[PDB]
Amino acid sequence: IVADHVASYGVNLYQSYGPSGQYTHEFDGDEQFYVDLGRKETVWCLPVLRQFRFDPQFALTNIAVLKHNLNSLIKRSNSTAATNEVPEVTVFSKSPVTLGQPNILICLVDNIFPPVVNITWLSNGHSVTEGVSETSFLSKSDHSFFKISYLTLLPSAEESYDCKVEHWGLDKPLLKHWEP
């Protein structure tokens, strides 16, 4: 559909493995907020949006409808499960890489399905836990997902970085390299 603005109010997700769910709202491809279903908390992604209120119970109640609708569909489709997809990984910096100045590495894992994945960072072949954040599963018109991970860093002339992606559609954990 061709339109000036595309909004999702919202994106409802429930899957059997876990089991896990996700409730988000999107406007023009960006996440407005998500509901921590385990905490019954609304977490806005734009500070300007903190002024609004959103009942997390709606998300919980909506997700419950998805679980009931799923079990119906699992049987009726003769147990047709999800096809594992090959995710595409791209690593880039948030700003131009000026040495000695803080920056953020951005790892875009696109074409994710099913929405199950670890995204982790590596520096010189070592696990990097601090400074790592990530978005939710953002929707796509083909009904796959993409997730973006962030790694804050002070780039230097010798420290290399790898974005690591483990996925079922992946025979081996995928590694996308980045160097200043």
Binding site: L13, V48, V65, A81, S139
Partner: protein, 192 residues
């Protein structure tokens, strides 16, 4: 008060996925608003409510029970029929004083490639932007390769507009950037 769309109830390891997308499509402000509710099994859309259709329609044979059953209920049809005004048009009012007011000005930097000049236009919102290379106020257009619009995920965009050039004495290269958040287009020059 952002209004959500509800989903109606139905009448390596393997995994089963269900997706519901309550979507709104806006054009020319609010004079052209369209609502499409999508019920998705795995990655296949099965049931749909298009505001331009006005009734539930089964995309595949799997959603055929649901569409027929959901259409049976006059109450459910009538709630969904009014959702365009109640959800889409209502939420666009909140968007007009928040998301649609977001103005992040881009940062423009020029640097030779790691010959090739790279104009980095980083951290801007909204996505509408135009970048043009000029050479002595003569617009370069044949040796320009622009990367696709990059979504950073934190409500900012970035784009890199390359240019392969032959540098000679006394030639200035300028990157012209136009963005809604700018009162006047930004020009970053480059001398060798």
């Amino acid at each position: 008060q952002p209004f959500p769309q509800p989903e109606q109830p139905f009448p390596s390891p393997e995994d089963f996925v269900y997706q519901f997308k309550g979507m709104c499509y806006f054009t020319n402000g609010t004079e052209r608003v369209r609502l499409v509710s999508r019920s998705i099994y795995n990655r296949e859309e099965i049931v749909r409510f298009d505001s331009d259709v006005g009734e539930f329609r089964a995309v595949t044979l799997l959603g055929l029970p649901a569409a027929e059953y959901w259409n049976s209920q006059k109450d459910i049809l009538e709630r969904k029929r009014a959702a365009v005004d109640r959800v889409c048009r209502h939420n666009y009012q909140l968007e007009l004083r928040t998301t649609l007011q977001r103005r992040v000005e881009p940062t423009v930097t020029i640097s030779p490639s790691r010959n090739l000049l790279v104009c980095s236009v980083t951290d801007f919102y909204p996505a509408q932007i135009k970048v043009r290379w000029f050479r002595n106020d003569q617009e370069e257009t044949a040796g320009v390769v622009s990367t696709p619009l990059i979504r950073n995920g934190d409500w900012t965009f970035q784009i890199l507009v390359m240019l392969e050039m032959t540098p000679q004495r006394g030639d200035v290269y300028t990157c012209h950037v136009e963005h809604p958040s700018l009162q006047s287009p930004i020009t970053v020059e480059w001398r060798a």
